[model samples]
Target: GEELFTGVVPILVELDGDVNGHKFSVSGEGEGDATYGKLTLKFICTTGKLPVPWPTLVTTLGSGGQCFSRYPDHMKQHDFFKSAMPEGYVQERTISFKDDGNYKTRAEVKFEGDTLVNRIELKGIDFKEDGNILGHKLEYNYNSHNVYITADKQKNGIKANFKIRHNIEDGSVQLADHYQQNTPIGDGPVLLPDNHYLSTQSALSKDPNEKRDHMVLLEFVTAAGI
Candidate 1:
C-alpha cells in the first residue's frame, strides 16, 4: 500500500471530534517525465472548532521540507548549495482557502538555490476542488528541489547527502545514507545495507563474545542513490 498511499498528502483530520487536536494533511506526486518534472500537492484539513488557516499549510513546505538543502561550512567545487537563488520569484508565503468553491489561486514560484528570491510562472494548479466538467484556473509553479537541481546544474547527474532531517509533522528525525560500490547482496531489489553495517544498533548477535550487547534498529530514511 506504500505505492498507493505514498503521494497522498494528508490535508485534514479531526481528532476525537474535539476540534482541539485536529490534524491536516497534504501530499504531492510525480512520475519521472522526460519533458518536465511534474508534482502535484493536495492539502485538506478536517474541520474543527478553529478552521485551519492557509499560513499553516504553506509553512510545511517552507520549513518542514526545506531542511534538505543546507549550506556547508566548507563549500565544495560544483556545490549546488553555493548558489541556491541564482534566479528569483515572488513567492506567496501565506495559505488561504475559498469556501464559495468558485475561486482558484496560484502558488507563486521563487527560485534561489539556498533560498527563494523572485517568483516565476510555472504551471501549477492547487484546485481546492477539481471537477472535470468545470475548468479551474490556478497559477502554480513546478519547482521541486530535485528537479531544479537537475535542470539548472547538471544533466543525468545524481547527488545525495546523508543527514538526519527533522520531521515537522511527526516531531521525529529521519536519515539518509549513501553507498558507492554495488556489492552482490545489495544489488538485489530489497535495498539491503551495503555491508555488515547494522544501523549502529541492529547488530546481528548479542552474545557475550561480542563487544556490544543490546541491539536496536537505527531508524532512518534513504534519500537518493544511483
Candidate 2:
C-alpha cells in the first residue's frame, strides 16, 4: 500500500455532494500524530426555487483542527525546537474555491527553504477543496490534494494525482465502510489511485514516449506553478 501510506501531516477528508455540479470527493489519511482532528462540514444549497435551500442539512466547517506552530517563540536556532509544528509544509497557492469570503485566507508555509509567513488557519476548510499534500514539484515523491488538473487532456479529463491514504477508522476498521467496499482490483491491499503514478512510478518522461502538462495549480485555481 505504497509504504502503508507515507506521512507528514496528510489528512484531507472530503465528501461534497455538489448540487449543481461542483463534484468534489477527496480523501486522505496519514497522520503520524503530527496533528489533525476536529472537522465537521455539512452542505445543502438552494436559492432560486427557494424551497428553503433544498433537502436542508447545511453544516459547514466546524472548529476542530488547529495546531500550526512549527517554529516560533523568538527563535534562537533551537529553543527546544521552539514549539515545533510541521507535519505538513510547502504550499503557495491552489485555490479550490467555495469560501465565498472572496479569497484571502492566506496559505504560505514553505519552511526550511524559507517561505514561512504562516497565515494558514483554514478551519472552515475549502482551500484547494479541503487541501492536504506534503510535497510539491511532485513527480514520484507523491503526496496529493490540488484537486485534478487539466489544460489539454480534453475528451473527458482528470481525477487523480496520487494514492494510498488510510484512516482505518475504529474498533475493527470501518474506514468508511472499507472505502465503500474495496475492490481496487487488489494489488496488495489496494489503497486507491485511479492514476497518478505507481507502476514503478512511470507517468512518462524518460522518453518512454514522453508527455507532460497537467500542472494542477488551480484557483478557479491557478496563476503559476512549476
lDDT of each: 0.21, 0.19
* Maximum-TM-score candidate: 1
- Which residue runs does candidate 1 get wrong by more than 4 Å? 1-68, 73-75, 84-116, 120-226
Question: How displaced is residue 168 in candidate 1, in Å?
Answer: 15
Name the lDDT value of residue 121 in candidate 1.
18
Model 2 residue 65 lDDT score:
20
Angstrom error at residue 171, model 2? 52
The clash count for each model shown is 24, 8
Candidate 2 lDDT over residue span 1-226, tens digit each: 1121123332322222332223322221112211111222222121212111111111111100212112122322221111222222212222222211111122322122211122232222222322221111112211112222222123111222222222221312111000001111112221112222111110111223313211111001111122
Q: When superposed on Cα atoms, how far off is each prediction in RMSD?
A: 20.3, 21.2
Where does candidate 2 clash, by residue pair? 8-87, 38-64, 42-59, 70-85, 96-128, 218-221, 218-222, 219-222
| Alpha-carbon deviation at 108 in model 2, angstroms | 22
* TM-scores for every predicted model: 0.20, 0.18
Cα lDDT for residue 7, candidate 1:
32
Q: Write the per-residue lDDT of candidate 1 for residues 30-68, one digit (tens) a residue.
A: 121111111122222223221222322232222212212
